[PDB]
Design a protein around this motif. Structure first.
Motif, PDB file in Angstrom:
ATOM      1  N   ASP A 140       0.758  -0.909  -0.327  1.00  9.80           N
ATOM      2  CA  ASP A 140       0.004   0.221   0.349  1.00  9.80           C
ATOM      3  C   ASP A 140       1.615   1.246  -0.430  1.00  9.80           C
ATOM      4  OD1 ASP A 140      -2.143  -0.827   2.451  1.00  9.80           O
ATOM      5  OD2 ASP A 140      -2.480  -1.559   0.408  1.00  9.80           O
ATOM      6  N   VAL A 141       1.962   1.008   1.063  1.00  9.84           N
ATOM      7  CA  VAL A 141       3.395   2.737   0.840  1.00  9.84           C
ATOM      8  C   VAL A 141       3.500   2.047  -0.264  1.00  9.84           C
ATOM      9  CG1 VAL A 141       4.185   3.192   2.681  1.00  9.84           C
ATOM     10  CG2 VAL A 141       2.733   1.968   3.536  1.00  9.84           C
ATOM     11  N   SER A 142       3.916   1.610  -1.069  1.00 10.84           N
ATOM     12  CA  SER A 142       4.866   1.417  -2.421  1.00 10.84           C
ATOM     13  C   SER A 142       4.373   1.742  -3.216  1.00 10.84           C
ATOM     14  CB  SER A 142       4.902   0.204  -2.640  1.00 10.84           C
ATOM     15  OG  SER A 142       5.663   0.113  -3.947  1.00 10.84           O
ATOM     16  N   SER A 143       2.230   1.890  -3.283  1.00  9.04           N
ATOM     17  CA  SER A 143       2.035   2.044  -4.509  1.00  9.04           C
ATOM     18  C   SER A 143       1.317   3.458  -3.811  1.00  9.04           C
ATOM     19  CB  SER A 143       0.988   1.829  -4.863  1.00  9.04           C
ATOM     20  OG  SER A 143       0.563  -0.250  -4.492  1.00  9.04           O
ATOM     21  N   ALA A 144       1.521   4.036  -2.680  1.00 10.19           N
ATOM     22  CA  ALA A 144       0.693   5.621  -2.248  1.00 10.19           C
ATOM     23  C   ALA A 144       1.953   6.192  -3.344  1.00 10.19           C
ATOM     24  CB  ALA A 144       0.968   5.252  -0.916  1.00 10.19           C
ATOM     25  N   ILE A 145       3.322   6.409  -2.477  1.00  7.13           N
ATOM     26  CA  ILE A 145       4.648   6.513  -2.532  1.00  7.13           C
ATOM     27  C   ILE A 145       4.490   6.884  -3.912  1.00  7.13           C
ATOM     28  CG2 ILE A 145       7.125   7.164  -2.906  1.00  7.13           C
ATOM     29  CD1 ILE A 145       7.047   4.835  -0.244  1.00  7.13           C
ATOM     30  N   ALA A 203       1.758   6.869  -6.872  1.00  4.06           N
ATOM     31  CA  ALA A 203       1.227   7.709  -7.327  1.00  4.06           C
ATOM     32  C   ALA A 203       1.727   9.542  -6.757  1.00  4.06           C
ATOM     33  CB  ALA A 203      -0.241   7.188  -6.574  1.00  4.06           C
ATOM     34  N   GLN A 204       2.331   8.835  -5.497  1.00  2.86           N
ATOM     35  CA  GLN A 204       2.300  10.781  -4.417  1.00  2.86           C
ATOM     36  C   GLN A 204       3.361  11.156  -5.279  1.00  2.86           C
ATOM     37  OE1 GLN A 204       0.111   9.917  -0.591  1.00  2.86           O
ATOM     38  NE2 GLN A 204       0.096  11.645  -0.463  1.00  2.86           N
ATOM     39  N   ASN A 205       4.620  10.151  -5.858  1.00  8.70           N
ATOM     40  CA  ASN A 205       6.194  11.229  -5.742  1.00  8.70           C
ATOM     41  C   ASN A 205       6.007  10.532  -6.772  1.00  8.70           C
ATOM     42  OD1 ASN A 205       8.584  12.042  -5.594  1.00  8.70           O
ATOM     43  ND2 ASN A 205       9.167   9.698  -5.237  1.00  8.70           N
ATOM     44  N   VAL A 206       5.805  11.714  -7.917  1.00  9.86           N
ATOM     45  CA  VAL A 206       5.423  11.816  -9.537  1.00  9.86           C
ATOM     46  C   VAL A 206       6.669  12.862  -9.850  1.00  9.86           C
ATOM     47  CG1 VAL A 206       3.473  11.549 -10.191  1.00  9.86           C
ATOM     48  CG2 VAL A 206       5.193   9.992 -10.774  1.00  9.86           C
ATOM     49  N   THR A 224       6.025  27.600 -21.648  1.00 12.36           N
ATOM     50  CA  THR A 224       6.092  26.437 -21.428  1.00 12.36           C
ATOM     51  C   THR A 224       4.928  26.363 -20.508  1.00 12.36           C
ATOM     52  OG1 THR A 224       7.635  24.996 -20.848  1.00 12.36           O
ATOM     53  CG2 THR A 224       9.051  27.080 -20.729  1.00 12.36           C
ATOM     54  N   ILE A 225       4.477  25.812 -19.696  1.00  7.93           N
ATOM     55  CA  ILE A 225       3.642  25.406 -18.343  1.00  7.93           C
ATOM     56  C   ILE A 225       4.462  24.342 -17.620  1.00  7.93           C
ATOM     57  CG2 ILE A 225       1.578  25.106 -19.317  1.00  7.93           C
ATOM     58  CD1 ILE A 225       0.504  23.637 -17.314  1.00  7.93           C
ATOM     59  N   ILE A 226       5.456  24.552 -16.150  1.00 10.26           N
ATOM     60  CA  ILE A 226       6.153  24.224 -15.742  1.00 10.26           C
ATOM     61  C   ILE A 226       4.982  23.510 -14.215  1.00 10.26           C
ATOM     62  CG2 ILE A 226       7.658  25.958 -15.168  1.00 10.26           C
ATOM     63  CD1 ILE A 226       9.037  23.670 -12.937  1.00 10.26           C
ATOM     64  N   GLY A 227       5.140  21.968 -14.281  1.00 12.23           N
ATOM     65  CA  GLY A 227       4.406  21.494 -12.829  1.00 12.23           C
ATOM     66  C   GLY A 227       5.143  21.607 -12.406  1.00 12.23           C
ATOM     67  N   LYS A 228       4.770  20.633 -10.788  1.00 15.72           N
ATOM     68  CA  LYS A 228       5.542  20.404 -10.341  1.00 15.72           C
ATOM     69  C   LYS A 228       5.967  19.067 -10.385  1.00 15.72           C
ATOM     70  CE  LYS A 228       4.672  17.597  -5.747  1.00 15.72           C
ATOM     71  NZ  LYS A 228       5.621  18.176  -4.800  1.00 15.72           N
ATOM     72  N   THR A 229       7.737  19.571  -9.732  1.00 17.18           N
ATOM     73  CA  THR A 229       8.993  18.450 -10.101  1.00 17.18           C
ATOM     74  C   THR A 229       8.877  16.984  -8.780  1.00 17.18           C
ATOM     75  OG1 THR A 229      11.188  18.310  -8.466  1.00 17.18           O
ATOM     76  CG2 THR A 229      10.355  20.121 -10.362  1.00 17.18           C
ATOM     77  N   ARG A 230       9.241  16.909  -7.838  1.00 23.21           N
ATOM     78  CA  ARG A 230       9.368  15.729  -6.486  1.00 23.21           C
ATOM     79  C   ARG A 230       9.763  16.099  -5.732  1.00 23.21           C
ATOM     80  NH1 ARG A 230      12.383  11.948  -9.097  1.00 23.21           N
ATOM     81  NH2 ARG A 230      11.814  11.909 -11.376  1.00 23.21           N
ATOM     82  N   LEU A 231       9.108  15.424  -4.452  1.00 24.05           N
ATOM     83  CA  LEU A 231       9.168  15.206  -2.984  1.00 24.05           C
ATOM     84  C   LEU A 231      11.172  14.834  -3.160  1.00 24.05           C
ATOM     85  CD1 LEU A 231       6.639  12.874  -1.884  1.00 24.05           C
ATOM     86  CD2 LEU A 231       6.522  14.544  -2.501  1.00 24.05           C
ATOM     87  N   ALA A 288      12.834  14.951   2.784  1.00 25.78           N
ATOM     88  CA  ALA A 288      12.548  14.217   4.027  1.00 25.78           C
ATOM     89  C   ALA A 288      11.021  13.961   5.004  1.00 25.78           C
ATOM     90  CB  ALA A 288      13.626  13.563   4.990  1.00 25.78           C
ATOM     91  N   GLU A 289      10.528  14.668   4.348  1.00 20.34           N
ATOM     92  CA  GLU A 289       9.176  15.464   5.710  1.00 20.34           C
ATOM     93  C   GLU A 289       8.157  15.368   4.458  1.00 20.34           C
ATOM     94  OE1 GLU A 289      11.190  18.847   5.592  1.00 20.34           O
ATOM     95  OE2 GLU A 289      13.043  17.585   6.299  1.00 20.34           O
ATOM     96  N   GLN A 290       8.574  16.145   3.484  1.00 24.26           N
ATOM     97  CA  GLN A 290       7.922  15.645   2.354  1.00 24.26           C
ATOM     98  C   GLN A 290       6.884  14.435   1.733  1.00 24.26           C
ATOM     99  OE1 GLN A 290       9.802  18.195  -0.383  1.00 24.26           O
ATOM    100  NE2 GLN A 290       8.365  18.350  -2.282  1.00 24.26           N
ATOM    101  N   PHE A 291       8.099  13.098   2.530  1.00 23.84           N
ATOM    102  CA  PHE A 291       7.768  12.193   2.324  1.00 23.84           C
ATOM    103  C   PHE A 291       6.523  11.085   3.802  1.00 23.84           C
ATOM    104  CE2 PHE A 291      10.872  11.609  -1.389  1.00 23.84           C
ATOM    105  CZ  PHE A 291      10.429  10.992  -1.766  1.00 23.84           C
ATOM    106  N   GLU A 292       7.211  12.205   4.966  1.00 26.67           N
ATOM    107  CA  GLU A 292       6.630  11.460   5.651  1.00 26.67           C
ATOM    108  C   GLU A 292       5.265  11.707   5.966  1.00 26.67           C
ATOM    109  OE1 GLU A 292       9.283  13.135   8.301  1.00 26.67           O
ATOM    110  OE2 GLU A 292      10.207  12.726   9.727  1.00 26.67           O
ATOM    111  N   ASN A 293       4.238  13.059   5.262  1.00 29.63           N
ATOM    112  CA  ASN A 293       3.372  13.411   4.835  1.00 29.63           C
ATOM    113  C   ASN A 293       2.896  12.035   3.634  1.00 29.63           C
ATOM    114  OD1 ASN A 293       3.257  16.805   3.994  1.00 29.63           O
ATOM    115  ND2 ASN A 293       2.658  15.992   5.908  1.00 29.63           N
ATOM    116  N   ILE A 294       2.548  12.369   2.570  1.00 19.47           N
ATOM    117  CA  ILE A 294       2.051  11.587   1.875  1.00 19.47           C
ATOM    118  C   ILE A 294       0.912  10.907   2.031  1.00 19.47           C
ATOM    119  CG2 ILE A 294       3.472  11.921   0.047  1.00 19.47           C
ATOM    120  CD1 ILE A 294       4.230   9.086   0.131  1.00 19.47           C
ATOM    121  N   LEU A 295      -0.621  10.794   1.983  1.00 20.11           N
ATOM    122  CA  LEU A 295      -1.919  10.027   2.705  1.00 20.11           C
ATOM    123  C   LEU A 295      -1.474   8.815   1.803  1.00 20.11           C
ATOM    124  CD1 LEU A 295      -4.117  12.807   1.093  1.00 20.11           C
ATOM    125  CD2 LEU A 295      -3.428  13.076   3.781  1.00 20.11           C
ATOM    126  N   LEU A 296      -2.263   7.575   3.505  1.00 19.25           N
ATOM    127  CA  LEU A 296      -1.827   6.523   3.252  1.00 19.25           C
ATOM    128  C   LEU A 296      -3.584   6.314   3.413  1.00 19.25           C
ATOM    129  CD1 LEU A 296       1.166   6.707   2.783  1.00 19.25           C
ATOM    130  CD2 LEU A 296       1.011   5.047   4.724  1.00 19.25           C
TER     131      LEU A 296
END
Ligand SMILES: CCCCCCCCCCCCO[C@@H]1O[C@H](CO)[C@@H](O[C@H]2O[C@H](CO)[C@@H](O)[C@H](O)[C@H]2O)[C@H](O)[C@H]1O
Lengths: 51, 50
Positions: free
Chosen positions: B1-6, B8-11, B32-39, B42-50
């Motif tokens: 679940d965690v793997s999948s979350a990361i 979908a959430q760290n792309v 050009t439109i720039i979106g978001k890079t990635r996490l 370490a915090e950004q990671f501790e976040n991410i909703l499971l």
């Protein structure tokens, strides 16, 4: 030589004619171009990381 | 679940182009439109909703 060839001018001619014949037939197959390859070789790497 | 979350959430959001060709008569602003890079943190990671 010289002295040798002064009394042998056919022989003299023939060494000249062979040289000319050889060098002539060469002019028929030489690559022609403005300049020789005078540019540093460069190799190029390309990738696109989309967006 | 965690793997999948990361996954979908760290792309990277792929991002397009405002006024991309072919465009309609007018256009004018092409940027050009720039979106978001990635996490990164370490915090950004501790976040991410499971
Ligand atoms: C980078 C690569 C280059 C490769 C090409 C090499 C070729 C060079 C050619 C040189 C050969 C010359 O050979 C030459 O022959 C003639 C023959 O008349 C001689 O000519 C003369 O020599 C002496 C000097 O006055 C006299 O005593 C003689 O009577 C007279 O004939 C020379 O002594 C000799 O030096």
């Amino acid at each position: 030589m010289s002295k040798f060839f002064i009394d042998r001018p056919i022989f003299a001619w023939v060494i000249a004619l062979v040289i000319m014949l050889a060098g002539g037939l060469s002019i028929l197959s030489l690559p022609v171009n403005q300049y020789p390859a005078i540019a540093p070789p460069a190799i190029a790497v390309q990738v696109s990381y989309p967006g | 679940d965690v793997s999948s979350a990361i996954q979908a959430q760290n792309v990277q959001i792929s991002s397009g182009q405002l006024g991309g060709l072919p465009a309609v008569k007018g256009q004018q602003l092409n940027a050009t439109i720039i979106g978001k890079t990635r996490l990164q943190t370490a915090e950004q990671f501790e976040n991410i909703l499971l």
